[PDB]
Design a binder for these strands. Structure first.
Ligand SMILES: [Mg+2]
Ligand SMILES: [Mg+2]
Ligand SMILES: [Mg+2]
Ligand SMILES: [Mg+2]
Ligand SMILES: [Mg+2]
Ligand SMILES: [Mg+2]
Ligand SMILES: [Mg+2]
Ligand SMILES: [Mg+2]
Ligand SMILES: [Mg+2]
Ligand SMILES: [Mg+2]
Ligand SMILES: [Mg+2]
Ligand SMILES: [Mg+2]
Lengths: 115, 98, 153, 100, 84, 206, 127
RNA sequence: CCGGCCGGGAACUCAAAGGAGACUGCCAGUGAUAAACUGGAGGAAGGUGGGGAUGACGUCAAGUCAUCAUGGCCCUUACGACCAGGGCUACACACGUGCUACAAUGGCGCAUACAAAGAGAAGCGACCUCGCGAGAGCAAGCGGACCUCAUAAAGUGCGUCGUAGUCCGGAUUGGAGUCUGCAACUCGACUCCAUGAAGUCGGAAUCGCUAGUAAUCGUGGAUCAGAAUGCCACGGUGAAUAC
RNA sequence: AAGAACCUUACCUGGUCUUGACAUCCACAGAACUUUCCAGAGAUGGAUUGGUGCCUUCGGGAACUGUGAGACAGGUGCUGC
């Protein structure tokens, strides 16, 4: 119930639980379970410690949690200090993939700031 | 077998055409299977009518391609030349096939 | 409308029981034109309530409806400054429609799980005058009683 | 539209027809997958050197009676306004007002 | 982005300028308009004035811009903020 | 309000098409452009001859042009020297062999196009528009049209506020589709701007 | 001998052949139970037979095309109705009083210009 | 070789032509013995059956000189023309019109049924092989009731989730990629992996709709090299209400 | 607006052209056409391999190109009062 250094829920099925690892979604969770030979509908608190060890080994293959976080952070910071268009967009906290900013863009710009 | 594809923009005119097709193919001696009506292609177009704005003001035009099929099983030697010399009225496209 | 409606639309009685009353109930419960889902939910609720009580599905449904059906409602009339909440007696078709609608509103607003469970529980409560539907009927009758002075109209 | 605009379109059509074959060849090298890297690179460069107006995507359909770039209808080669006028005057075969 | 089968895209005239400038040493900034061109590995150290609509923004090419369009480092809009 | 074209709304019902050639999506645009060019050239070169109608057919890689005209002698000329040149140029424009056939138009006073052209020519010549309109209506109702409506709109008589005036006699039921409403328009380029003439002529039923 | 009828509903066309037999109903080479998932559809198919009380003494061979489940069910119902019409004319009054002879002439109304659907106008605002 | 597959059949569904039908025709009552109305039979349709096209004289000196034509004025080493880059895609904000949601009438997984209408020749692209997928290779067939687009989805059967900002919800962003196009940075669509936001039904106010309509589910087309949640059509399921 | 990456595009920054990109008409020269090299962001300018014909009053015209003055051409410039 502690894979890649984080607590994962014991009450949920294995596929749903493994998605709690920052870096594993449904697809990677299914791949991990298949490679470790564990049913997709089994609940975490009902796996043998050997099975959890194998799961640890599998999830160790992929970059997750802190390593992934700092990888993403160094990619963003490289964009930043290069100061290309995407670096400038990231600095200003505006949409980065060519969306419209005349309206919407609330996810990047934050909620309404009245004048 | 001889295959005649008649395409026209007017059902009356194409009916005249296919009538005289069968009359010629029967005077020549050969027997005819038809005419067969194949489904009309109703090509529809929608166009704004004002030169400026007014989006809800539209005309809807339609072009009805009527198509008839003529079959000539047992194609007599005179039948073939008669059909190819017949020279249909304008407004009909005739495709001849074997 | 300013003219008059023709006869009401024909309704095919539901297959399991052959009751147009239940057909109307299914239609009222239906959402986004998914009559299959509405009928399955209604049928599950009916069998569940019949099993919990003992009554036949149809008669138990009739009892639940009757405990919710109103008799007089209030409509708005204009004279001036204020409005008249004039109490008018209801015709039976509107009675059944209102009873069904109130039952379905209460069932949807209930906090259970499957809507069949919600509907069975709500109808069971109506079978002894407990649901939000019978509460709404209570409110309608006591409002009409309050406004009874305007009944003469 | 403007006479200059119509002239531009004519020039683009002429260049596309003139240089069509060479563009076809070079794009064949590029999208061929068993062509050497040197071949694909030189083909990219030569396709660059070919004039831009030769690209058939550079063209813009225009109403042949007014040059209007909007509201085109490929079946007739005219914009909506000209199609409407000719159709009502009867200058379009078979076409007539639809109702269904 | 560009399909990998087609490889990278460099405009021929900019490639010529770059190869001649690199083989003949440090020179004047490469005044160029090819914003759509790719920064190749042998681009380092070159100062290139990439057009942006009215100006030729100077860009000192370094290692970490390899594989990026030169037009990305020359912004084409001006913005300082509303009612500052 | 605006009104539907009395020709277009009746094309498939009681009117014919001014073009009855069949072609598919490969040929439709080119044939339409060539028909437009031929009609434009014919009208320009036969402005004097009073060409009432131009029908075009394309039997088989050929173009047949029937020119319903009010002065067939004028459009033909001596023997056929004029129609021969017209046919040559029409064939060159259409890129195919040509065949010009002149059609007699009896009574230019019951044809909407010819009436409109006459009225426009008078307007260019600066005749009073009220007199031109009254003359047109009287001529048609004496030739025996069951009804006629004439409308003239624009800067009439050098006015600076454009107005519309229309005369009418008999019946012109534009709503009935089976009624024979021959309708046509023309423009008159006067020194004070353009003036539009529209003519409806109701000639009968079925 | 086989008695034939044609039913139509929405855009469904159902050829229905009836011949006296053991009460077997075949729809598109498939039994009714596993061809129609809706008990309403099964009721719709069997409605004429049960209302004329001839449910077991006829055999149905039916082929239907076009439409959806309910449209096809109505097409079947119309097909049996007409097949029994041309079987006997004596049950005509009963079937009309029931309301099965009538071909329900209700199609999907065409979409119109300036409306989102048949009648759903775009949302209006004074300003 | 269970596939109309082949021989065949012309019945049937369909395809397209021509006809018939519905007219207040008949009956009853009401009604100024009139128009007509309230019903009833018959009939597929009963009262202008449903829908569409059809927009009267005229009103707003309403809109368009940027489709076009056009009087007058104006520019003409130019206010015309050519070219490459950029912008029309900018964002403290405000409004309109929509899409997806806020979940269990649901989500996900597996199997499976039922459509109409349209398109297509530097075009639609089978089958097969490869790729996890966008797609790639060879490549038939078809200007077509033949071939392709193109397995409809909602629905049904089983399991799962069990009311939680959640297997809801999909924004945003990182990495890796496919296709079109000379070229995808400004500024494309799509795919895989990852991230997983706001949102728990929305104040005053306000909109659409009386039938196969609303609601809901998918499909096609025009424009188009690529680029729809828009627009225009098509079918599937399918109500409540009108005193 | 039935669909702005370049085009569209009418706007902006620069590089350029002015009887002009598109029309007639005047004269002269030259068949056109095709390919190739340089410079320039491209426009555009230098060249030039090949080509040098189609009818013929065989001498010239028909086309297609450049040049040379124009009469003009061009305007998505204003005015929908
Ligand atoms: Mg112009
Ligand atoms: Mg384009
Ligand atoms: Mg709209
Ligand atoms: Mg009328
Ligand atoms: Mg204005
Ligand atoms: Mg815009
Ligand atoms: Mg989800
Ligand atoms: Mg398409
Ligand atoms: Mg497209
Ligand atoms: Mg629909
Ligand atoms: Mg642009
Ligand atoms: Mg006005």
């Amino acid at each position: 119930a502690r894979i890649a250094g984080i607590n994962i829920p014991d009450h949920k099925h294995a596929v749903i639980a493994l998605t709690s690892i920052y870096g594993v979604g449904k697809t990677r969770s299914k791949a991990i379970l298949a490679a470790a030979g564990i049913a997709e509908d089994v609940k975490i608190s009902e796996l043998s410690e050997g099975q959890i060890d194998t799961l640890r080994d599998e999830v160790a293959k992929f970059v997750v949690e802190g390593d992934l976080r700092r990888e993403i952070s160094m990619s963003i910071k490289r964009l930043m200090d290069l100061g290309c268009y995407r670096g400038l967009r990231h600095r200003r906290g505006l949409p980065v993939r060519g969306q419209r900013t005349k309206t919407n863009a609330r996810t990047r710009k934050g909620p309404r700031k009245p004048i | 077998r001889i295959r005649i594809r008649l395409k026209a923009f007017d059902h009356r005119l194409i009916d005249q055409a296919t009538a005289e097709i069968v009359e010629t193919a029967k005077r020549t001696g050969a027997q005819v299977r038809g005419p067969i009506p194949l489904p009309t292609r109703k090509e529809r177009f929608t166009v704004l009518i004002s030169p400026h704005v007014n989006k809800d003001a539209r005309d809807q035009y339609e072009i009805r391609t009527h198509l008839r099929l003529v079959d000539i099983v047992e194609p007599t030697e005179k039948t073939v030349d008669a059909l190819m010399r017949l020279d249909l009225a304008a407004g009909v496209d005739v495709q001849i096939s074997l | 409308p300013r003219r008059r409606v023709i006869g009401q639309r024909k309704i095919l009685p539901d297959p399991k029981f052959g009751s147009e009353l239940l057909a109307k109930f299914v239609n009222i419960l239906m959402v986004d034109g998914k009559k299959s889902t509405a009928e399955s939910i209604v049928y599950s609720a009916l069998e569940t309530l019949a099993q919990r009580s003992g009554k036949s599905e149809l008669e138990a449904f009739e009892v639940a409806l009757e405990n919710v059906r109103p008799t007089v409602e209030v409509k708005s009339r204009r004279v001036g400054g204020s409005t008249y909440q004039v109490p008018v007696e209801v015709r039976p078709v509107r009675r059944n429609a209102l009873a069904m609608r109130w039952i379905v509103e209460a069932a949807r607003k209930r906090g259970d799980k499957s809507m069949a469970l919600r509907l069975a529980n709500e109808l069971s409560d109506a079978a002894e005058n407990k649901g939000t539907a019978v509460k709404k009927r209570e409110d309608v009758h006591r409002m009409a009683e309050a406004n009874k002075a305007f009944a003469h109209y | 539209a403007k006479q200059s605009m119509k002239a531009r379109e004519v020039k683009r059509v002429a260049l596309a027809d003139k240089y069509f074959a060479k563009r076809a060849e070079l794009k064949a090298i590029i999208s061929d997958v068993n062509a050497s890297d040197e071949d694909r690179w030189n083909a990219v460069l030569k396709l660059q050197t070919l004039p831009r107006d030769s690209s058939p995507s550079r063209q813009r359909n225009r109403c042949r009676q007014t040059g209007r770039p909007h509201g085109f209808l490929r079946k007739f080669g005219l914009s909506r306004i000209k199609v409407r006028e000719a159709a009502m005057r009867g200058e379009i075969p078979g076409l007539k007002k639809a109702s269904w | 982005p560009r399909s990998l089968k087609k490889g990278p895209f460099i405009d021929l005239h900019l490639l010529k300028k770059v190869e001649k400038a690199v083989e003949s040493g440090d020179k004047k900034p490469l005044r160029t308009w090819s914003r759509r061109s790719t920064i190749f590995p042998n681009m380092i150290g070159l100062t290139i004035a990439v057009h942006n609509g009215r100006q030729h923004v100077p860009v000192f090419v370094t290692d970490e811009m390899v594989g990026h369009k030169l037009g990305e480092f020359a912004p084409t809009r001006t913005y300082r903020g509303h009612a500052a | 309000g605006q009104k539907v074209h009395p020709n277009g709304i009746r094309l498939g019902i009681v009117k014919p098409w001014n073009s009855t050639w069949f072609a598919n999506t490969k040929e439709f645009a080119d044939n339409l452009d060539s028909d437009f060019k031929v009609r434009q050239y014919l009208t320009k070169e036969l402005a004097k001859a009073s060409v009432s109608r131009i029908v075009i057919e394309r039997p088989a890689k050929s173009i047949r042009v029937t020119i319903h005209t009010a002065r067939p002698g004028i459009v033909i000329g001596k023997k056929g020297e004029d129609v021969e040149k017209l046919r040559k140029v029409v064939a060159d424009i259409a890129g195919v062999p040509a065949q010009i056939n002149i059609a007699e138009v009896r009574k230019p006073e019951l044809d909407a196009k010819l009436v409109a052209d006459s009225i426009t020519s008078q307007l260019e010549r600066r005749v009073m528009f009220r007199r031109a309109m009254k003359r047109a209506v009287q001529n048609a109702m004496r030739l025996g049209a069951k009804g006629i409506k004439v409308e003239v709109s624009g800067r009439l008589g050098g006015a600076e506020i454009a107005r519309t005036e229309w005369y009418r006699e008999g019946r012109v039921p534009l709503h009935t589709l089976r009624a024979d409403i021959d309708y046509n328009t023309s423009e008159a380029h006067t020194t004070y701007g353009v003036i539009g003439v529209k003519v409806w002529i109701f000639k009968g039923e079925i | 001998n086989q008695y034939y009828g044609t039913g139509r509903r929405k855009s469904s066309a159902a050829r229905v052949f009836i011949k006296p037999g053991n009460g077997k109903i075949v729809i598109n080479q498939r039994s009714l139970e596993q061809y129609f998932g809706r008990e309403t559809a099964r009721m719709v198919v069997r409605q004429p037979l049960e209302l004329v009380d001839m449910v077991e003494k006829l055999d149905l061979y039916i082929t239907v095309k076009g439409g959806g489940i309910s449209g096809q069910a109505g097409a079947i119902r119309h097909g049996i109705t007409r097949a029994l019409m041309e079987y006997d004319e004596s049950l005509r009054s009963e079937l009309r009083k029931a309301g099965f002879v009538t071909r329900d002439a209700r199609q999907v109304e065409r979409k119109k210009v300036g409306l989102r659907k048949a009648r759903r106008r775009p949302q209006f605002s004074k300003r």
